[PDB]
Amino acid sequence: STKLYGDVNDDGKVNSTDAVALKRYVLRSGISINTDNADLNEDGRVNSTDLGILKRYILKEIDTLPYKN
Ligand SMILES: [Ca+2]
Ligand SMILES: [Ca+2]
Protein backbone atom coordinates (compact mmCIF):
# COMPACT_ATOMS: atom_id res chain seq x y z
CA SER A 1 0.00 0.00 0.00
CA THR A 2 0.92 3.69 0.05
CA LYS A 3 0.57 6.68 2.38
CA LEU A 4 -3.09 7.40 1.63
CA TYR A 5 -4.76 10.26 3.50
CA GLY A 6 -7.34 8.23 5.40
CA ASP A 7 -5.94 4.71 5.26
CA VAL A 8 -5.43 4.00 8.96
CA ASN A 9 -5.52 0.21 8.62
CA ASP A 10 -2.74 0.45 6.02
CA ASP A 11 -4.51 -1.69 3.41
CA GLY A 12 -4.08 0.58 0.40
CA LYS A 13 -7.63 1.91 0.26
CA VAL A 14 -10.02 4.13 2.23
CA ASN A 15 -12.73 1.84 3.60
CA SER A 16 -15.41 2.28 6.26
CA THR A 17 -13.22 0.27 8.63
CA ASP A 18 -10.73 3.14 8.53
CA ALA A 19 -13.38 5.43 10.02
CA VAL A 20 -14.29 3.29 13.03
CA ALA A 21 -10.61 2.46 13.48
CA LEU A 22 -9.60 6.12 13.75
CA LYS A 23 -12.39 6.72 16.27
CA ARG A 24 -10.75 4.13 18.52
CA TYR A 25 -7.37 5.88 18.44
CA VAL A 26 -8.87 9.32 19.05
CA LEU A 27 -10.62 7.86 22.10
CA ARG A 28 -7.19 6.86 23.44
CA SER A 29 -8.26 3.23 23.80
CA GLY A 30 -4.84 1.92 22.80
CA ILE A 31 -5.30 0.90 19.17
CA SER A 32 -2.30 0.74 16.82
CA ILE A 33 -2.95 2.58 13.56
CA ASN A 34 -1.23 4.62 10.86
CA THR A 35 -1.14 8.11 12.39
CA ASP A 36 0.72 9.23 9.27
CA ASN A 37 -2.29 8.39 7.10
CA ALA A 38 -4.77 9.54 9.73
CA ASP A 39 -3.50 13.13 9.56
CA LEU A 40 -5.72 14.48 6.78
CA ASN A 41 -5.01 18.14 7.57
CA GLU A 42 -1.32 17.57 8.33
CA ASP A 43 -1.65 19.32 11.69
CA GLY A 44 1.06 17.09 13.13
CA ARG A 45 -1.20 15.06 15.42
CA VAL A 46 -4.26 12.83 15.10
CA ASN A 47 -7.02 14.81 16.80
CA SER A 48 -10.82 14.88 16.62
CA THR A 49 -10.40 17.15 13.60
CA ASP A 50 -8.78 14.40 11.53
CA LEU A 51 -11.57 12.03 12.53
CA GLY A 52 -14.28 14.36 11.27
CA ILE A 53 -12.38 14.93 8.03
CA LEU A 54 -11.98 11.19 7.45
CA LYS A 55 -15.68 10.59 8.06
CA ARG A 56 -16.76 13.55 5.94
CA TYR A 57 -14.51 12.34 3.12
CA ILE A 58 -16.42 9.05 2.95
CA LEU A 59 -19.72 10.89 3.39
CA LYS A 60 -19.22 12.75 0.10
CA GLU A 61 -18.58 15.95 2.05
CA ILE A 62 -15.01 16.66 0.96
CA ASP A 63 -13.18 15.52 -2.17
CA THR A 64 -10.21 17.90 -2.10
CA LEU A 65 -7.35 16.32 -0.16
CA PRO A 66 -5.27 16.73 1.76
CA TYR A 67 -7.00 19.38 3.88
CA LYS A 68 -5.27 22.61 4.92
CA ASN A 69 -5.99 23.26 8.60
CA1 LIG B 1 -8.11 1.28 4.64
CA1 LIG C 1 -4.11 15.82 12.02
Swiss-Prot record:
Residues in Dockerin domain copies: 1-67
Binding-site residues, Ca(2+) 1: 7, 9, 11-13, 18
Entry's localization field: Secreted
Binding site residues for Ca(2+) 2: 39-40, 45, 50
UniProt binding sites for Ca(2+) 3: 39, 41, 43, 45, 50
UniProt family annotation: Belongs to the glycosyl hydrolase 48 (cellulase L) family.
Purpose: This enzyme catalyzes the exohydrolysis of 1,4-beta-glucosidic linkages in cellulose with a preference for amorphous or crystalline cellulose over carboxymethyl cellulose.
Name of this protein: Cellulose 1,4-beta-cellobiosidase (reducing end) CelS
Gene source species: Acetivibrio thermocellus (Hungateiclostridium thermocellum)
Phylogenetic classification of the source organism: Bacteria, Bacillati, Bacillota, Clostridia, Eubacteriales
Parent-record interval covered: 673 to 741 of 741
